[PDB]
């Protein structure tokens, strides 16, 4: 239960592609209450990304199957129940992250880049909840996502260079929120195009540490733009 040991085990779990183990280690690190280093922060994010990603992918498959089996009630009821079980896992994972975010990560964020990272993450995990939200709760979930993204967005435009990978990654995910959650293609495109164009005009401000991350995100911004406007 030592911190450096937990971090090393997390790295080992990542190599082994055992992301449940990875998330458990990094959760334990976070719960010790100290602000996460950049490396620790990224390990936590990678771990939960894979843990929730597996559920998101499974959910899409099963929800799709559920829809296409109308009039075969026994098979559909079976598909529905399985979707709901996956959904419960998914919600528990998102609530796990969102709780760590409220209790430790966002309050301990001393610098702007860290505050943007965590607010972005809060935006993401509410967005994943919104993907599977139905009825009453959806509008509330959607507003929680939007508000976290919006605050991150404003802070990033004030404190970070246009080519900063965290600022670009936020624009990318916030544009996806507009496209997929708010059904506003036009606002999604505007946001993506601006982020891309402002980064393009300043490639000299890239560093050796971030030029690969930043240029990959730019490429994805443009990939999305192309798809959305076809």
């Amino acid at each position: 239960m030592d911190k450096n040991e937990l971090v090393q085990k997390a790295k080992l779990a990542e190599q082994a592609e055992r992301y449940d183990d990875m998330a458990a280690c990094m959760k334990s690190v976070t719960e010790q209450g100290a602000e996460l280093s950049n490396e620790e922060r990224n390990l936590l994010s990678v771990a939960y990304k894979n843990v929730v990603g597996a559920r998101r992918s499974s959910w899409r498959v099963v929800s799709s199957i559920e829809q296409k089996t109308e009039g075969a009630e026994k098979k559909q009821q079976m598909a529905r129940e399985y979707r709901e079980k996956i959904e419960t896992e998914l919600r528990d994972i998102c609530n796990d992250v969102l709780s760590l975010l409220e209790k430790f990560l966002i309050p301990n964020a001393s610098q702007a880049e860290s505050k943007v990272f965590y607010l972005k993450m809060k935006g993401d995990y509410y967005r994943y909840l919104a993907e599977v939200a139905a009825g009453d709760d959806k509008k509330g979930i959607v507003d929680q996502s939007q508000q976290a993204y919006q605050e991150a967005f404003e802070i990033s435009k004030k404190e970070m260079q246009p080519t900063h990978p965290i600022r670009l990654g936020l624009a990318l995910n916030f544009s996806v929120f507009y496209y997929e959650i708010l059904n506003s293609p036009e606002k999604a495109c505007s946001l993506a195009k601006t982020a891309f164009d402002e980064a393009i005009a300043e490639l000299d401000t890239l560093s050796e540490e971030s030029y690969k991350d930043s240029t990959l995100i730019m490429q994805l911004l443009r990939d999305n733009l192309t798809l959305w406007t076809s």
């Binding site: 990224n42 990654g169 996806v176 994805l220 990939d223 999305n224 798809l227």
Partner: peptide, 8 residues
């Protein structure tokens, strides 16, 4: 081809 979000 599908919508992509931030990879890491």
């Amino acid at each position: 081809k599908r919508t992509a979000s931030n990879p890491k």
